[PDB]
Amino acid sequence: VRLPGLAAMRQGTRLFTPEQGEDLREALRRRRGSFQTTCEVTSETTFAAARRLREKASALAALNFASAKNPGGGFLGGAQAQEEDLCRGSGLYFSLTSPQAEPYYAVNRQSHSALYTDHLIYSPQVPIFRDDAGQLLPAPVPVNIITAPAPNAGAVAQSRPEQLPQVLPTLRERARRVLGVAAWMEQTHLVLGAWGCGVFRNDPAGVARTFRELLEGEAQGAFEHVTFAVLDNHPQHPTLGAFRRELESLCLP
Ligand SMILES: Nc1ncnc2c1ncn2[C@@H]1O[C@H](COP(=O)(O)OP(=O)(O)OC[C@H]2O[C@H](O)[C@H](O)[C@@H]2O)[C@@H](O)[C@H]1O
């Protein structure tokens, strides 16, 4: 008994390949300067912020902090993983397992680099069915989802230390492509966050500054509103705190 909205989502799912990198930058150029971009850092989950923004804006997309190699990351290592949260509360997994998304996983596996490749998946109108607590929503809230894997810094450290200088450059260019996909699909509202900063062991300050520099440069004014929704259950909030400090100059009113 296939849930409503999932067929259209799977059908509409789209693969972006590394060779489309220049078209993704063209999308950014087309959208730059469209808005006086506002942004904020919150302690919300991805879907809580998405649900909040979706009530004001239809053209809303959220970033999935994706595995490169298995849809939903195989649900291994802990449910404290953002992609697992996304796949337990929405139709995302049925999108990520679509046939047209297959090369993302095949090529990333064949790559044998923990930097991974610049494949991205765009899932349109993924219905969110449940809230943060697993309770049913009064109505499913469909959001667009951009799936891209941050480079796996922790794996790089253990296997190819000579590639450690390429982790942040890889992160930066793939983040640019994430924004390019949103620009290509004319998204006005984005939910970003601490991409690569948990399981993949990237430094949160460096990730926050990477997004800030893109929003001040090649992605300047391309979006109407960006929320950095950073779940951080540690009482000292080292990850939320890093994003708040690196993005404060930007996200002031
Ligand atoms: N629902 C959530 N919403 C918003 N932020 C979250 C959420 N959950 C965690 N965070 C915060 O975001 C930070 C990073 O969340 P992470 O999920 O580790 O993303 P990664 O890119 O480093 O690892 C991706 C792998 O982990 C998965 O297994 C995938 O399948 C991949 O294999 C966390 O530390 C939290 O501060």
Author numbering: 29 to 281
What text does the study give?
Therefore, we attempted to obtain crystals of DrPARG in complex with ADP-ribose. Crystals were found in several similar conditions, but they belonged to different space groups. The monoclinic crystals of DrPARG in the ADP-ribose bound form gave the highest-resolution X-ray diffraction with space group P21 refined to 1.97 Å resolution. The missing 11 residues (100GGGFLGGAQAQ110) from the catalytic loop of the apo-form structure could be defined as a loop region in the ADP-ribose-bound form. As compared with the apo-form structure, the bound form structure of DrPARG showed additional secondary structures: a short β-strand (denoted β4′) following β4, extension of β5, and an α-helix (denoted α4′) preceding α4. Like previously reported PARGs, coordination of ADP-ribose involves serial hydrogen bond formations and hydrophobic interactions provided by surrounding amino acid residues in DrPARG. The side chain of Asp113 located in the α4 helix contacts the N6 atom of the pyrimidine ring in the adenine moiety via direct hydrogen bonding. Oxygen atoms of the pyrophosphate in ADP-ribose contact surrounding residues via hydrogen bonding with nitrogen atoms in the main chain of Gln110, Gly224, Gly226, Val227, and Phe228. In terms of generally similar binding mode of ADP-ribose among DrPARG, TcPARG, and PARG structures in complex with ADP-ribose from Homo sapiens (HsPARG), the conserved catalytical residue Glu112 of DrPARG does not form a hydrogen bond with 1′-OH of the ribose″ moiety via its side chain. However, like in HsPARG, we observed a solvent-accessible 2′-OH of the ribose′ moiety in DrPARG, which suggests the internal binding of PAR polymers to DrPARG.
